[PDB]
Structures are given as structure tokens and as C-alpha cells.
Nucleic acid binder design. Structure first.
Lengths: 77, 144, 191, 67, 182
RNA sequence: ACGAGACUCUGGCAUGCUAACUAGUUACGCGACCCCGGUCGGCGUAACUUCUUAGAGGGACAAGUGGCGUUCAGCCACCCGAGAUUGAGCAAUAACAGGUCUGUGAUGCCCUUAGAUGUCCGGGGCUGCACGCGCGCUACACUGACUGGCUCAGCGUGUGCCUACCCUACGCCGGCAGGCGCGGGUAACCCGUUGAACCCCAUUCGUGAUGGGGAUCGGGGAUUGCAAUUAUUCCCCAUGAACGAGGAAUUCCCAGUAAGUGCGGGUCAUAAGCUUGCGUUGAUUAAGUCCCUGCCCUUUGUACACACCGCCCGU
């Protein structure tokens, strides 16, 4: 019965950005909701970061919808 | 860019009230009493600030620009029907009023109604429903 | 040229129903394989006609509940499609095999019914029907996904995906496995 | 308990009358596949027919009536 | 931050425990064990009383502490079964005495760790292992190895100094124990 | 003999029959655009009823097959088949101190009848508020809110008798609520191919009593009407309460059903949170029982018969 009041940050600081850059492309299933849950960030920030890495070519797009987007990692070889 | 900039102010003191910087700039100034969701869009449209930015990272020039726009609506091509106080009973001019001024104007309006002893002022003094609705069943939490 | 009926992009063959008592209540192989889980209906007219309905169509039918979602079949279809895509993208397995395994492992096999007068508490354990096992599995998985996706940032298309993943292994971190084991323990307590 | 009872799969042969207080359950005459000589009567809950296989967690219980 | 009371992750069968009820359910209910880091248990409707009942909320009373005895524990799936019907009044006095002494020891050590400013479940587990679990395993007494330990170490520093936990944190914990248990 | 059934209306189909410039289809010609063909609810005239409209007829009867049954009345399943239980209307004897004298120039008796309990005008009340109950509307959110785009119906109604008050295309002005000139329809002719909502696609929002929810309250502007204050109705900007899935208890329903969603009619000068119909999307569970609340038939017992809400004993 723990409350643990949430404080989701709006803009990326120094450390969360490079932990994202080292962990998010090594995830099997990539979703804005699950990366916001894992990194304790806001939802719009997660969408902006995944759009940025989609433009950077490190993220493979699968399906695009108005409710959610689904992303996956690239092959190691 | 996506990294937080330097001197990102967490709070704001616009018109002596605390305004957070985490909310959207089209919606953080909604917490200022007297300015709502619809009024915040026109102020940020006459002034050249995009509405996709956050509240705590804008600079003081555009902050004071939209502040002088909010205290001076009509001199920036804002139409007279967009104002919350049109044709005031004392001075007779269109002037949008802000928070403490809004409370003062409402207080003196209720004082004027009680002084002239109209039915609306009497119902406001008694503390009942004044707009003319049924009070037989609804409004149970007025007293114990 | 319909060689096999691709369910959107998934094959309908090479799937195994391990439980022999559910061979004719899971309509997925070679007869009831359609491109989409939307049909005209006419399955609830007779007494056992709902057993020939495909399991993904029954999942989409039982997915929409709680007032504000009644009649919206297309939204449940696209949530089920996105859930199947997430399940295939996560486990690397066919989504129909995960769904069929989630049906078998989440189905209770013994239930206690209430006996006595109106007011007393007394149970008696009986075994259940193969159809009611499937119905309880679908209902438990759907209400577990619905309760998991409420007042949360996590969408229901991946909440339903994690619902079928945890139910297929019996890891007891899902609502459906926990309620099945609760029903089994209450039935086993007074046989 | 200290007894891991093996599960039994059994196949019905006929459907008897529907017992229970509100008629929620019915009685069947069910038989096994591992020994197709032993036949017991069981109280089953749910929509049943002639030909469906029931998963019996125990095989040594005889069907009680409604009370 | 909260930590478990004893080294046993799940209680043994036929063990008394002080339980707070969380919510009532249809087939049973949902409860929480205080001295096992708030894990979800279950009490049954048939395990309430031997006699007839005319009000389910007369004896359950969600939001109130209750003494129940463990029935079935499954460590593989985390299933806990409780029984209030088999609870005898003879062990009840020893039950809340053990619960109160364990919760006062836990409160004192949690205050000491909050003074030390360490916020991690593994950190609380390690410090509480260095403080209480070691002498509890040494004296072979579940619950009874802490209150008597602090009672004998309030006036004797050599008994408290036998644990090789730390120096400054050990002195802070000894001062906190001597300030409370006087 | 009555009741049931039988009967009537509607739905589900017939590429067969009868006819459609107030309904269309297909060919042909003209015209517009694109790269030799495609699109046009653009224009017009050679056949036809495939769509629509509505008349006569047809079709379903447990007809065929296999089991159960005195092999009788019937039941179950299956094949061919648009249907192998569509929904309603009408609805017997005997009564209830059931509701209506406030529907009536339907009415017995009683009261009043000129300072009227008749009638008429002006103002007010029917709304008034420490509280309780019933039918309901909107919500408690992310299967969601906002902002654009795309796209799909069926029941109806419509210029009135003393009676004045209809539905609206098109063009201009104004953010909007609205205002002014012009035309149509006494109606398959005009509104109207009723560009309806829920849905679908794409941004913004990110678990925060928050961009949820819109109660309360202030100012201004229009329309109806002789008159709106006790705000008629609508529009614009502010104000931003309770409410985090609801205790004991309790209502309705099983197939295009419940539920979500909008549109008509009735009230209507002004007008739907009500009622009655219509269409769109569209399920879970069940083919059983007499346990609860009741109903129909038979047997049995009775000190009850304004009939168990009965009757009746003692301090």
C-alpha cells in the first residue's frame, strides 16, 4: 500500500539522455508508454525522443496509428 | 534542443502568483485568474510566440510582451466582444480585468447590489440561489 | 489464389492445441480461418452454435464491455491486431499459438457452486464443461487486460499483449491465472 | 495431503437429468479412455453434450445429489 | 522505505500473525500481512466462524487489525491461505506482544536508517541483517531475539559491540536503542 | 357456446406478372478535365423494370428422411430451402366502494346566485427551503478529451375555420447567436441525393482533481411576445465546486436483443433533461429450474367467509 507520488520530468537532463541512447535501441519492444514508464519521463518527451531516434536511423518503424506507435530494435549483425 | 537549457526557471511570479514552467505556455497562464483557455490563445497569437513551447524556457522580452498585451488588450487588434467586462457600470469602457481586480470588481458589484437593495443583492446577501432555479431538492450542502 | 488464409499477416496452420478436451471448441485450423475477426454473426441463435465461432472473433466480441465501449467492434479489432503484432514482435512466436496456449492454461477445471438456503454460505465442488472453460478463459483474460489498462499511461493494446504472454507460461503474475488458481483452491478446499 | 493425484481425462456417454437448486448443473454418465470399462456418474456444471471430454482431477468420487 | 520483519520470506504453517484487512471480495477477501512486507493474502467466508453469521461486516471490518492463523503457504506462486476460525485466545496475547515488540524494533531501526539516509531495499536488508537477523539466528528465537537483545544491551555496551556492522552507524543505533528502550 | 386457436397489420423473397417525366436503370449523342481509355447527382432523347414505388397472386404445411413414443396425439435432429418459434392488434364469466363530477350542452342530490363559489381586468402565487423519497440527464477519463480531414440512413412534418402562428434553398452583412432583399412547396414535384451522430484517419495532451467534469457566479449582445425582475430562449468572455467505479438494498432484458449513438412527432408565439416512434454500430451469457417472489390443476385438513392484513386464550 505504497503511494509513491509520480513526478514525470518534461525536459531531458544530461544523464537520462545518454542512458536512453544506450538502452532504448537495445530493447526488443519499444513503445512511448513503456519507455516513459521505464525512464520516469513524460509522454510527449518520449514521443519526441523516439521520433528523433527514428530520424537518426537507430529505430525501425513497424506500425503507425493515431492511438499508438510500435517500434523495434535493429539487427546486431 | 531536447536537452534542458540553462537557467530554466521552475516557477514564475507573473502577477504575484506562482506559475509553473512544466505546463504548456498556452495553458500555464490559464492558472492566472481572469485569463482562460480561449483568452490565452489570442494573446499568444498576436504576439509572435509559437504555442508548441514550454512555459519555463521562454525569455523575459516575450514574457513582458505578453504581459503588456494582457493588461492592454484593445490596443493590439483584439475585438471588444472578447472581453470579460464590457460596458462597465461605473466608467463605461471596455477593459479586461485580472485576478485581484476581478475579485475587487465582483465585491463592489455585490456591495452595489446590496446597497440598492435589489432582489439579486438580497439573495446574494442571504446566500441562496440567485439565478432563479428550484431549491426544494438541490442545494443540500448550504448548511447543516 | 487462396493457398492458406493469412490472418492479416499470420499463418493459420502449424498451431497445436495441447489439451485434447478442447480439440473441437477452438476453431482455428483449416476450416474456420478468416482474414479478419469480423463476421456477420448468427452464432447466438442456437444452443451450441457459438462453439464454431473463431477464438479471435470471440475475443473481440468479449473485449468490449463497461457501457462506453458497447457496439464498437472496429476499435476492438484494431486493438487485437496491434496486440498480436506486439506479441509477435516481443516473443518471436506466432500470435495464434500464444493465444491458444493462454486459453488452455487460464481455464479452470473445477468449480464450487453455492448450495443451501438464501443467506447461508456452503459450497460443493463440481467439474466444468469444456465450453465454459473457454468462456471463463476469454472473460478472465479480457477483464484482466481491462483492469490492467485503467488510470495508467500503458495502453490496452500492450496490456492485452502482456496479459496473454504471462498467461501462456503460468507465471501467476497475471489476473487470469491468479483467479483460476483461486477458484481451484476454493473448489479443492471442500470437495 | 502428500498425494499428487494424476489427472484423468474422461468421455461422457449419456446425459441424465439436471440436478441442483436452480438447475445450474447436470448429471452425466462418464467413462475413461485409459480404462474403457470403468464408468462413473459425475455432476458437471456448464453447457455439455454427448461427446465432450471432461478433465477429472480425481476419479474416486461418486456424484452427490442436489443436497 | 519499508523492509520485512523476519528472514523467512513466507510464514510457516499453523503460525499466528497480526493481519490488516485490505478489501472484501466475493469468494474470499484480500488482506495484507504486516510482519512479512505487506504481501497479499486471503481469508475465506467459510473460515470466519463456526456458527451462523447474520452480518459479514460485523466481524470482517475492513480497516481493522485481525489475528489469523496460516493454513496453506505456496512459495512457488506466492499463495497464502489464512484461517480465523481456528484461532484460539490462548496464543493471542503472545501474538500482539510479539507483534508490538517486533514493530518497535523495526521502527527504531528504520528511524536509525532514516538518520543514516540510505534509501534502498537491499541496503535496508543488509543493515538489518547486520543488526538483528544475525543475533536472531544466534539466539534461535523468532521475534524473541530482539527485545531481550536491546534490553540486555541498553546497560551493556560490550554485548552490543559484538556485531561487526559499522562504527558510527552502530553507535547511532546503540544511542537510539538506549534512548527509547530505557 | 365463449376464451385460446382461427382472424387483421407489419417484417423477411419472387431477375416471373401488371405500370411509372411527381421514381429510376442501361445504351447513344453533345459538353468539361487528365494520360489511346477513365470520371461527371453536367445536358438531352431509344429500350427496360435490374434499384425504388404498390396491386393481384405464389410460398411453409411438421411437407421429406432417421430415431423416441400404445407406434395415436406428438418430440428431437438433418437435407433442399429468403424463412422449419418476426413483432404487435383484438382479447371470455364473475367482480373491485380501484381512478375520473377538473374532458363534456353526460348527470341525481346538496350549496351559492348580485358586496357571487358565475364572469372580466390588473398584480401575485402554482418555482417559494433546516430536511426525506421516486423517475431521470451529465460525469468520475488515455477503449479518453481537443483540433482538422474523410464518409454513411430511415420513420415523419410543412403555409392552419372563427385562427393571427409553416418548412426553407440561394445572395449580402456580422466571430457567433442573428438581420435584409429574393424564389420554391399545398407536396415521390421544394427544403432533400434529408452530406445526422456514433465510427475511421492524423496532431496536441500524459495519470496531475489535469486540456476530465461544467455545478455556482459576473458583464455584454440578439430573437419571440403587450409584458421576462423570481435571470423565457440563445450566443461571447471570465468564474472552475462536488465527483477517484459508489454501503444495506434494488430494477430491466436473452437476437439485430441489451447497451452506445443521433434524428422525427406530441406539447410549441418563445421550447426538451419527458413521452412516443425511427434508423446506425452491435455483444457476453442461457435452451434450465422451482431455491426465493408468484401463477394454473388435483388430493388432503380447517374453530376462517368484509375470506390469514382471518380467527382467538390468559395475567
Amino acid at each position: 500500500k505504497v503511494r509513491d507520488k509520480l513526478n514525470n520530468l518534461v525536459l531531458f537532463d544530461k544523464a537520462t539522455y545518454d542512458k536512453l541512447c544506450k538502452e532504448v535501441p537495445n530493447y526488443k519492444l519499444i513503445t512511448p508508454a513503456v519507455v516513459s514508464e521505464r525512464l520516469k519521463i513524460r509522454g510527449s518527451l518520449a514521443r519526441a525522443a523516439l521520433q528523433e531516434l527514428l530520424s537518426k536511423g537507430l529505430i525501425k518503424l513497424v506500425s503507425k496509428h493515431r492511438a499508438q506507435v510500435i517500434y523495434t530494435r535493429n539487427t546486431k549483425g | 534542443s531536447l536537452v534542458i537549457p540553462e537557467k530554466f526557471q521552475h516557477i514564475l511570479r507573473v502577477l504575484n502568483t506562482n506559475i509553473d514552467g512544466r505546463r504548456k505556455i498556452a495553458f500555464a497562464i490559464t492558472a492566472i485568474k481572469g485569463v482562460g483557455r480561449r483568452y490565452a490563445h489570442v494573446v499568444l497569437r498576436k504576439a509572435d510566440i509559437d504555442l508548441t513551447k514550454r512555459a519555463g524556457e521562454l525569455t523575459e522580452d516575450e514574457v513582458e510582451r505578453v504581459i503588456t498585451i494582457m493588461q492592454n488588450p484593445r490596443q493590439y487588434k483584439i475585438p471588444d466582444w472578447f472581453l470579460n467586462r464590457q460596458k462597465d457600470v461605473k466608467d463605461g469602457k471596455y477593459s479586461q480585468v485580472l485576478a485581484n481586480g476581478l475579485d475587487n470588481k465582483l465585491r463592489e458589484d455585490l456591495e452595489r447590489l446590496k446597497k440598492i437593495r435589489a432582489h439579486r443583492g438580497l439573495r446574494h446577501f442571504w446566500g441562496l440561489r440567485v439565478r432563479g432555479q428550484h431549491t426544494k431538492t438541490t442545494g443540500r450542502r448550504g448548511r447543516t | 489464389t487462396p493457398d492458406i488464409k493469412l490472418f492479416g499477416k499470420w499463418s493459420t496452420d502449424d498451431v497445436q492445441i495441447n489439451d485434447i478436451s478442447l480439440q473441437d471448441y477452438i476453431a482455428v485450423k483449416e476450416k474456420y480461418a478468416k482474414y479478419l475477426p469480423h463476421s456477420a454473426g448468427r452464432y447466438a441463435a442456437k444452443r451450441f452454435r457459438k462453439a464454431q465461432c473463431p477464438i479471435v472473433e470471440r475475443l473481440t466480441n468479449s473485449m468490449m464491455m463497461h457501457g462506453r465501449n458497447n457496439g464498437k467492434k472496429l476499435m476492438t479489432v484494431r486493438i487485437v491486431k496491434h496486440a498480436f503484432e506486439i506479441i509477435h514482435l516481443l516473443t518471436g512466436e506466432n500470435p495464434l499459438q500464444v493465444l491458444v496456449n493462454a486459453i488452455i492454461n487460464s481455464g479452470p477445471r473445477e468449480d464450487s457452486t453455492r448450495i443451501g438456503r438464501a443467506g447461508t454460505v456452503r459450497r460443493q465442488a463440481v467439474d466444468v464443461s469444456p465450453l465454459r472453460r473457454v468462456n471463463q478463459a476469454i472473460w478472465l483474460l479480457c477483464t484482466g487486460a481491462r483492469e490492467a489498462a485503467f488510470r495508467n499511461i500503458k495502453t490496452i493494446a500492450e496490456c492485452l499483449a502482456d496479459e496473454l504472454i504471462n498467461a501462456a507460461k503460468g507465471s501467476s503474475n497475471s489476473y487470469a491465472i491468479k483467479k483460476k488458481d483461486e477458484l481451484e483452491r476454493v473448489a479443492k478446499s471442500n470437495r | 495431503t502428500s498425494r499428487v493425484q494424476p489427472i484423468k481425462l474422461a468421455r461422457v456417454t449419456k446425459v441424465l437429468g439436471r440436478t441442483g437448486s436452480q438447475g445450474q448443473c447436470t448429471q452425466v454418465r462418464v467413462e475413461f479412455m485409459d480404462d474403457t470399462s470403468r464408468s462413473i456418474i459425475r455432476n458437471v456444471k456448464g453447457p455439455v453434450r454427448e461427446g465432450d471430454v471432461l478433465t477429472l482431477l480425481e476419479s474416486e468420487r461418486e456424484a452427490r445429489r442436489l443436497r | 522505505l519499508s523492509c520485512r520483519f523476519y528472514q523467512h520470506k513466507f510464514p510457516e504453517v499453523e503460525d499466528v500473525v497480526m493481519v490488516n484487512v485490505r478489501s472484501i471480495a466475493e469468494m474470499g477477501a484480500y488482506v495484507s500481512l504486516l510482519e512479512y512486507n505487506n504481501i497479499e493474502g486471503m481469508i475465506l467466508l467459510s473460515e470466519l466462524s463456526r456458527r451462523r453469521i447474520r452480518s459479514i461486516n460485523k466481524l470482517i471490518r475492513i480497516g481493522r487489525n485481525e489475528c489469523v492463523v496460516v493454513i496453506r503457504v505456496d512459495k512457488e506462486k506466492g499463495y497464502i491461505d489464512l484461517s480465523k476460525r481456528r484461532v484460539s485466545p490462548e496464543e493471542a496475547i503472545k501474538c500482539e506482544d510479539k507483534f508490538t515488540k517486533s514493530k518497535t524494533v523495526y521502527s527504531i531501526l528504520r528511524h536509525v536508517a532514516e538518520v543514516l539516509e540510505y534509501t534502498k531495499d537491499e541496503q535496508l536488508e543488509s543493515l538489518f541483517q547486520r543488526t538483528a537477523w544475525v543475533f536472531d539466528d544466534k539466539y534461535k528465537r523468532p521475534g524473541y531475539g530482539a527485545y531481550d537483545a536491546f534490553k540486555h544491551a541498553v546497560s551493556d555496551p560490550s554485548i552490543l559491540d559484538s556485531l561487526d556492522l559499522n562504527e558510527d552507524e552502530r553507535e547511532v543505533l546503540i544511542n537510539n536503542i538506549n534512548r527509547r528502550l530505557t
